[model samples]
Target: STGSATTTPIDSLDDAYITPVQIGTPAQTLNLDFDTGSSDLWVFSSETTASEVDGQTIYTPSKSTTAKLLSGATWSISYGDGSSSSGDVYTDTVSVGGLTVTGQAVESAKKVSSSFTEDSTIDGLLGLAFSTLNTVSPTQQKTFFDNAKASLDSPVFTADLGYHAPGTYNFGFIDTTAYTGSITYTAVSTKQGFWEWTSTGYAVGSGTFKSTSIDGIADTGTTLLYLPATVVSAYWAQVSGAKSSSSVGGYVFPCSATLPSFTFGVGSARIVIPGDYIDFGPISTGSSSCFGGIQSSAGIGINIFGDVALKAAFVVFNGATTPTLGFASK
Candidate 1:
């Protein structure tokens, strides 16, 4: 939990990732979070105290010059992690990626936690994934992808995210050179988020880690991969003399040897998370560096393929022309 990639504080290059959405009839701008974790896009508003909402960026309708609120259809959401927010709906002329979209419906949160109380670079998120996981209903036009999918040149969306730098966000046809052509398209399961898929299991080195199978899901909102007990055990088994540890709610291996290569299946695709991922940090007692590719996911709700997964190679979320996702070498 402490040493993994995070989804907060994303970069807004095209402005497509985070842009103005409307709330209420008066037309207020709310900073939206383009999260795959949930479908609802919201922002902190005048109702929230400046203190409670500290680190996140919120929209100022007064300053936008063109922002407007929808006047009705209020929006609010509470995540499984217990983070929650609420706001009214608004619409306005907004700019993203040098494109102008008129009267986009955006949520303006009247109240927000300190998590959203921080900066001014850009406020909120604009989810480009499927609409099933969206907090907003089909009545609200689903997701930004749903609305903009047809207009995209390639009808594909790809995020080349990184840990310590500005990640690349692309729309239309994905650049094939960014990833290996090991493509797999899992059936979309509309549960918590739009189109969640289960991964049978993952393997590292010569060992066949079949003892546990993990249900893997692709999520831009999350930054780390989580697994179940059986899955974690199978991975740890590959580590020389590795043992389970409750400290991290997972397993730990004696950081004594060089880790091996690992590959996991996403539908029919073989995703290779390099050995460098396996070496983490001094976050724990074990001198062994952590492995980014392989981590213990004993009891997490869902095993996520996050930026750790996304950054490894170029991935395409084919939302527009076809229903299949594409992955190619970077």
Candidate 2:
């Protein structure tokens, strides 16, 4: 069977998209960030400390008779942005669109970071990464996709993210109408529990495509594109008035700077990120300075093709034997 859902942007940051999901019997609906960088389906819940849960919806497992506590199992997670959460575990029915997984492990947070608490609109995160990365203690848990994959007609899903518009996530199938040109397939290495792949090279605007091996993951939750420090510096060199700002962080340039398109190579096919999209927006509202969406991945090691890069193409996360990634122009 096939299932699909629509995702909506939260605020002007366009940093992340939210999708509706139902957990437990009687269906407790919550808006969750569909993240492919991690593997764990966790949510803000009744267990979350009162001081930490503000203006956000909570999932009360007690309200669902199907909820089953997994004694002694606990979970704790830390994000690259320093955000974190720790929680207990439970098994319950979880559904997205029309696809339902019974007895799916659900991590209910008892503690959350200020970063997560302050975001009133995001209720939780539904991780789409490989199940091997799940953090549940004692016994790791399977993600919604892992639990539903066997029953799906095809173990595949497509991400059609948009800029300042609505997009759809398709499960168990691929919609050819969603993209232009033939999809380019690339090998994926799940060694890091991510949809990791290597791009043959990249270029700035109409510049020559440099031949460099860039290893990165297709992360939907991340807001910006992250490449090596040298690559980042090279790209900014072509832009006038660009500098690495300590105060604003990352690379910044004049808002009126003439931006250049960034292109990445996947096999023989090329996927390009438009020049305008590279300017993530002003450093602050009404400010004349803007931050470049592509930055250095020095500390993180592997590059990250975050929303800034992923939004530029139609992506297929294929989970057949030896996982693979498919990309095409939108």
Candidate 3:
């Protein structure tokens, strides 16, 4: 796999950036989202033009010791939910507690709204998606993870959010000490901006999609794993008890007991997709919609297995010395 030329390649995204890095005081901390799709950090601000960026959380610059702007960079991002924001790029002495990362890229939306501001359990997003498909080249961009890596006991980052409301989102330093035995890892392919790899097969209940594909790069910023629609529907077809249904904001399955599991072999690593992460929270339309942990989106050509589902296992992103991802325990 190709390595990242920049510092923070493994982005963490939310409505805004929400990385539980060493930001505020340990007793009173702020978890900001980090997105990689676009190389910008956005937060709610005092001078933001509220009318334009509605429903988005704003960050008060007063909270930090350093805050400034890039030479002339500005940004705006839109989501599938019709939520969007635009703002100017600012540099700040952003830290995750005592660990302060200087000259970090951040954005302060000129406008904000209430639609996305209704306390979505997070204040902002930390985009780790991608700058754009064509611009695969990376720079020494900084992220909280990069700054903290130097101090962490284990110089590795692990994400375990497959169980969070959407599931849990954990990062920073793998507890290589936690595992009783030696740790093994599988290499991920560096294709474009995505961390893609070949999967031996995909299993759902009794049916299977043999010789399928896998995407290592996840849209922790997005909601669902945008899988090929045809492939998702086919997997559900095999599960008699699992019926398709709609839910608030996404899909679900009422037959919680009959939930299907998916297994994919990444190199020598075999990952078991938990049923709970697949058929997540309830939706409005129906109680039983099989959210096979995968969906489809034409706009998002690359397959993005959102962090919601991948949180089940530990993913080690080697962005510093080498560009590689090592899979571990769930």
Candidate 4:
């Protein structure tokens, strides 16, 4: 059996993709941010403090007949940017597209930081990473994808994140019509509980490709692309008015700068990021300054291939034994 879900971008160009998910018996639907960087199904809930709820939708467990609280079970998670959420756990039926999982752990948030409270659109997050990253105490919880894999025809899902466009997430089966060209496969290392892989190297415009091996994660939740300091510096050097700014943070350049295309190597596949995509709009409204989509992943420990980079190609996240990443031009 196969299932598919539509992913819609939150804003212009590429930001984050959100999909509809149903939880509980009566089906309380919520637009969740599907994240490949973390593993936990959490949502804004009735228990959240009123001040933190803001304009976000809250999941009401009391309204669902199938909802059952797991006594003393709790969850807490902190992102790389210091955003956090903590909550209690409940078991309920969860469905994504046509695939449903019975007794899936639903972390209902009781406390949320300002980062989540301010983002009114995202009501919750559905993690697609390995189940080992789940934060539920006493007993770790399985993700929606992990629980539904056994019933699927193939243990693989495809992410077609696009720029200023609508993409589809296909589960159980690959849609040959969705992407063109042969898919190039790369070996993946999941010891870190992420879809981690080593990038062969990168180049600035028509320059020669370097032979450095950079380890990074393919994170759908991250908005921008991040690379090693040396790679980022080389790219910025090619821009006339680009420089690292302490006040603005990261590399900033003139909005009118003629930037060169950035290319990264995946196995033998060459994925090119157009020059125009590097200018991430204006740094602020009514200004000519713009922020470079590529930034340094200095303190983060590992680099991140975020939405900006992922949108340039069709990605297959194969969950079968010896997990691998398959890429093809869109």
Candidate 5:
């Protein structure tokens, strides 16, 4: 009825969070990115070309008795960052933390782009988004959550992505001690296959709270927080020597700058992001300037509340008939 798992940042910068996943009868383990922004459970497999695997692990479907090819099913996905991979479909047993789900759809990679091959941290992605976003062709498949919800006690799960340490993911029940105060419930717009919600504007440092309506998806898969140009520019202006760089692709500032905190509203809750968290690591290796954790969402089309905002709170993905998202300060 319940399952628990720990999530860890792939690197010191918390570029992405990863969790252990066990697949097949004998249980070959792999590190997977639990992306709420996506809707497919895909992995590197034997079919993935040797030239593109780099140092990553590959799934051997032949080794698992539970692995069976799904006739006529194929998949391909291109990420926002230009990373892509595609494969044929297979049905197998999937185990995460202490919970097991049999007959789970596992997309096996037959091709991968250079982006996936270059970075060896993530072996695959475990999509927690809506099933509507699944990439499988001929017939779409349900996400792992959709399949496991029936057996869960509450049909919901929680994401606690950490900054530098390990965080926990709880299924079927909310762990009270993980967060302080109470959760603020907000309506979720799942039309785009995201945990999208409306945020009640934001404030720079301790300035007056802007009462504008800002909407975005809580995308754990994304590394940075993306908001409107006005909000981003307002915050960046307070930092000394902060400027948007075309070479770097976003706002950058001196790592030693005295940064201001960022605050946003959810219902009546005020979630504050410390200034320290805004200093999104250095721009380049041993570089003096750091890329801002908060960036303009103008080009992104939709606002994205990614790890930058997520690391500061406890998030709940309520998966009942009419889904909702709950947020609480930790």
Candidate 6:
């Protein structure tokens, strides 16, 4: 079987993309961030601390007759941003787009980070990275994608993200109309539980294509693209008045600066991100300085091809016998 769900940006800055998911017997809907950087299908729920619930919707397992407690199961997860969540687990009927999975583990949040509570748009996250990254104790659980993989016509999914628009996360088969030209295939290293791959090189705008290998992950949950400091510096150098701000702790440039497009190689295919996509947004309210979407990954330790980069192209996460990634221009 095949299914797809439309994911939309939560805000103007495209901070995060969210897709509606139905959980429990009655099909309570929640907008979840489809994350490819981690493996846990967690959510805010009736079990969450009331003070931590904030404005987001909560999943109530008791209302779902199909919901079953995962005996002696518990989970805890911490992100790169310092946000953390821990909870007990339940197995319920979960549905996304038109696909359904029975006995899917649903981690109910007992506590959540302030950042998560403050962000009212997201109810939780559905991890599609790898089952090995699952945080459930005693017995690690399979992610939604992992559980639904075998039953599908094909054990693959595709991400069609967009700039300031909606996109589809389709499973089972690739939508030939979603992309242009041929898809460039590359091997994926699942050792770290991410869709990690190496890029052939990158070009600053229409400049020379620098030949260098960059290992990074295609992370949809993350907002900005993070690269090595030297490569990021090379990109900013092309922009007049661009600076690595001490206050902002990132690269920034004047709003009037003429930005150039960025291109990166996937196997032999080149995917281009329009320069305007790098302008990010203003440093602050009415600030003339705009932040760059590409930031230094020096502190992060791993390069991240976040939404800023993923939105520019069509990405395929194929989980056949050997994991692989396919990229195509749109």
Clashes of each: 61, 0, 65, 0, 0, 0
Across 1-330, the per-residue lDDT of candidate 2 in tens digits comes to 888999988877677899999999899999999999989899999999999988888999999989999999999999888899999999999988898899999999999999999999999999999988999999999989889999999999889998878888889999989999999999999988999999999999999999889999999989999999989999999999999988887899999998999999998889999988887778888999988999999978779999989999999999998899999998
For each candidate, what is the lDDT?
A: 0.55, 0.92, 0.51, 0.90, 0.92, 0.94
The Cα error of candidate 2 at residue 224, in Å, is 0.5
Q: How accurate is candidate 4 locally (lDDT)?
A: 0.90
Between the candidate structures 2 and 6, which one is better when assessed by lDDT?
6
Q: Top TM-score: which candidate number?
A: 6
Number of clashes found in candidate 5: 0
**lDDT for model 3:** 0.51
lDDT of 4 by residue, 1-330 (tens): 678889898777566788888999899999899999999999999999999988888899999999999999999999998999999999999888888889999999999999999988889999999999999998899988898889989999989987788888888988898888888889999898999998899999999998788899999989988999999999999999899998998899998899899999899788888887777888888889988999999968889999888888899999998899988887
In candidate 5 the C-alpha lDDT for residue 210 amounts to 87
lDDT of 1 by residue, 1-330 (tens): 001111223442121133334443344445444565566555565545677655554566665656665655776677544556666776655433433345666666777644455445445656555666555432554565565556566666676654444455565555555565555565555555454666656676666644344556666665455666555555667667766555754445556656666666665556666655555543455566343334544445656666566656666666633355555445
lDDT of 5: 0.92
Please list the residue runs of candidate 2 whose C-alpha ends up more than 4 Å from where it truly belongs after superposition. Answer: none
TM-score of each: 0.74, 0.98, 0.72, 0.97, 0.98, 0.99
lDDT tens readout by residue for model 5, 32-72? 99999999999989999888899888899999999999999
Global fold similarity of model 6 (TM-score): 0.99
Inter-residue clash pairs, candidate 4: none
lDDT of 6 by residue, 182-278 (tens): 9999999988889999999999988999989999999999999899999999999999999999899899999999899999999888999999888
True lDDT of residue 316, candidate 5: 96
Worst 10 residues of 5 by lDDT: 275-284
